[PDB]
Amino acid sequence: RRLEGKVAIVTGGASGIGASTVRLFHDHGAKVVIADIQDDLGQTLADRLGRNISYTHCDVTDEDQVRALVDAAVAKHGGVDIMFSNAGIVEGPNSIFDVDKDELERLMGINLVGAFLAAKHAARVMVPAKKGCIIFTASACTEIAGIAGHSYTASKYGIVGLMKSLAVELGSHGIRANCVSPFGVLTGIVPDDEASKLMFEGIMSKVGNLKGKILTAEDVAVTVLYLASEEASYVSGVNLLVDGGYTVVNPTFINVITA
Amino acid sequence: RLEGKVAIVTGGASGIGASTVRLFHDHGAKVVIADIQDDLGQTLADRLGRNISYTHCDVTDEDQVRALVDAAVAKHGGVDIMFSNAGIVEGPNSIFDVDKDELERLMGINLVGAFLAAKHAARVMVPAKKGCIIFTASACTEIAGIAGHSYTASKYGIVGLMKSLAVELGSHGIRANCVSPFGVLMFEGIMSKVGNLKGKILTAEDVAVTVLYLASEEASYVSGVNLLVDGGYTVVNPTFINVITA
Amino acid sequence: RRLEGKVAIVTGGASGIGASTVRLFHDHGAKVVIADIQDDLGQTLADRLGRNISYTHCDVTDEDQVRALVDAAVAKHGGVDIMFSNAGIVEGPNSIFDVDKDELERLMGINLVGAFLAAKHAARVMVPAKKGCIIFTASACTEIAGIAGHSYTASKYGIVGLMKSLAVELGSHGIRANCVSPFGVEGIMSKVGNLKGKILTAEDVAVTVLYLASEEASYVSGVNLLVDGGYTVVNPTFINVITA
Amino acid sequence: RRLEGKVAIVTGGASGIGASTVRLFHDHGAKVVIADIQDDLGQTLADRLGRNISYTHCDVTDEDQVRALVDAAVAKHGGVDIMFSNAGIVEGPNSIFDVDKDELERLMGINLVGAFLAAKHAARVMVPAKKGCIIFTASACTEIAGIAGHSYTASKYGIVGLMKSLAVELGSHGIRANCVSPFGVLTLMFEGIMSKVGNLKGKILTAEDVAVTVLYLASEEASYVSGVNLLVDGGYTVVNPTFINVIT
């Protein structure tokens, strides 16, 4: 359909949002290369999807590995059209007294430095092609505070600013750099049959502002499909939230005055 | 796609409104062209065919807006998409070029037209616990210098409306988002010379597919978002680079 | 005394935030023109404060009245340094079904069109002076939804876009255009407010405006300075559900 | 004398904006503890100003040193009222092809991780006192892109997010956390570019200007200001003058 004959690299594409983006991009004609370090999940997936889907282990904290993944993909299919820097690790809401200098630098390496390096080499191969699309995974905590840890928030804020400066610089060559800032999708925490899904799906019905629909990974996948489609040929520098209006309301006032 | 949905497009006789209308017809929904260019509007709504009706509606008349909505809800069964596109534009100007009579008139067309479309779309959508309201703002919401003072302030108010609307209509499962395009309203040579994302020209069909996305079940969880279509123009002040590297 | 020899016009300056800013500007040397439509309160204040404080009735929805207010201030003192478009009417959180087209247009006139006109005639006299300072009153609802009505929200959003596009235009002459977006116009305030231990009074919004209008802000322009104690930066629904 | 009887710590306080805030805080009563790694400048300054101003070497990349700097101040004075995370290194506009993983990580350490540790240990002593104030040095590139490099841009954006969630968390105890995002660039031909690039014409952005903005942000005058990224840009980040300039 929308991605017939396009080539995509999806870091973290073996689990959660990346896996759904990978399945979706496959469904729309794209030549996709799963990139992750969960090698069983990743390689099994790229073989389950099949002919147009490859896998490539890549630690985003090692530039040699990153440069290798892009150049391998360039050699297999001909070029890179979509670069989805999804790989990251999360941190729930916490205190600054729970920030460990070690855990902090590790979190930053995976989230932000992985984003820089993934972008740097995506740009390196895209500039000569004068065509392309780069999409970062930030989070809703970029527009509101209180749904993520301090280091995780700070890492995703930097991801947003990087995406911005990328749109300016990389615009000169006609390739776009956008974000997506989804919410808490039911893929990160451990699954256990139907009890966990229904209870967590009920709490999302509680906390979310837009009630009646629940955020799946496929939902974030189609947002990225649009953001990566040529239907967005003039969208760049945009941090498109998929939050149902959570980051635009502090209902403390209404709820206190309704008691 | 949009099969079996209902669309109301204020300003659907010219440009962006007409392109979104042709798109919604092009696959799926039943569209109700609403504008005051009745020749253009009726010509289009007849060229398109069965699923496309027309209805004169001056957005400054709450009774006319109420009538258009209620006629469509009675004709098809309900209203799924409300596209508050109708408006008048004004390029960059001075505060001294604002005429209070022009000011209030433009404010009437842009901001009050959105308000009334919002109120009566909400009136018919809330009981269905469904709906989609999509405002046409402008790129001047994130940067200033591409629109006049009355225009920017009118679109800033549209955003605050959309925000507070999404919070309120969230309780019922209804989404309220904006789209803030750039310049579709020689012309294309200057547009290239200014745009940040070079190579691609911003047409009305571009916003049409953007609005289709925002209204699609593919956006089941997008609400409170002012989705710019600017190619990164509103996120850069190229003065520093242009002065120190020219 | 940070306002020695300056001239300020404070629309809505007879009640609340305007009255607090006006007493403050008096406290720092400034010659102030209280502008409102509550003529009793305004002249009482302008007589109690003393020589450097005058009054001028001005319905901001009447351009002739505002143009008169500007020129009266220019003729009385020599010029205008500060134009504080504070006058406005409030509307608490409500529904879209409670928006009345006539009541809507009234709030817009006072809030947005009053601000437009106050700016236009402040600009008219400030451009030739090659200096100036303009401060609008928005509200914390500029950054969050759920603490104000739909019409008030949209009017204050429009005020912000006005202030922004104005700071761009009036920069060429050395003129600044800023906003202030406070929270409290209480035990309830203690409960809702994010920054605990203190409370937003009118004097706080007044001293924020004093800074914004001082030379302490010589290069501050285009800013919508929130005074919310971090209310507009947190949606605690998630954490509050999971803590019990 | 607004800061009468207050105690302030300024990391990077031996040079520039930190130095301007330090003398300003001295002028307004406050007891200041200069923290930097240019030990010559800092001690020269801290003895220049006099009895209420001391100096303390502190590499913010060393959690042990920052913990010592905070505890030294509490041991000297009793507590910490103001913490100004000013220390950082700059990067002008660049390309992503000029990004070195070793340099990037170093800049990230000094700018963002130093902020985390300085904030963490300021909080360590401020929470029990149920009072305090944390102020970061960001930059004008937080609201516009085109006056800083990608590594600086991302580091100051992250500095903003830290301040936001910190203000959310530390509000419960009566502590405020704000940022200031000056126009770091502009601080004969220097004057020609000042006339050219700046939006608000007619005024020059000095370090003392940013110093006085921080004085307000740290003063009682901001008793209810928290979570705010107060830009000092003269409206630079609110206009893309390309459109008007092309049509002229």
Author numbering:
A (entry chain C): 8 to 266
B (entry chain B): 9 to 193, 206 to 266
C (entry chain A): 8 to 192, 208 to 266
D (entry chain D): 8 to 194, 205 to 265
Lines quoted from the article behind this entry:
Herein, we report the specificity, substrate scope and activity of a set of plant borneol‐type dehydrogenases, with special emphasis on the highly stable and active borneol dehydrogenase SrBDH1 from S. rosmarinus. The overall architecture of SrBDH1 in crystallo is tetrameric, in agreement with SEC/MALS measurements confirming a tetrameric state in solution. As a member of the superfamily of short‐chain dehydrogenases/reductases (SDR), SrBDH1 folds into the characteristic Rossmann‐like fold, that harbors the cofactor NAD+, and has an additional short α‐helix at the C‐terminus. The NAD+, as well as the strictly conserved catalytic residues S146, Y159, and K163, complete the active site.
Binding of NAD+ leads to a defined folded loop region from residue V197 to S203. The apo structure of SrBDH1 lacks electron density for NAD+, and the latter loop region is not defined. The remaining apo structure is practically indistinguishable from the structure of the binary complex.
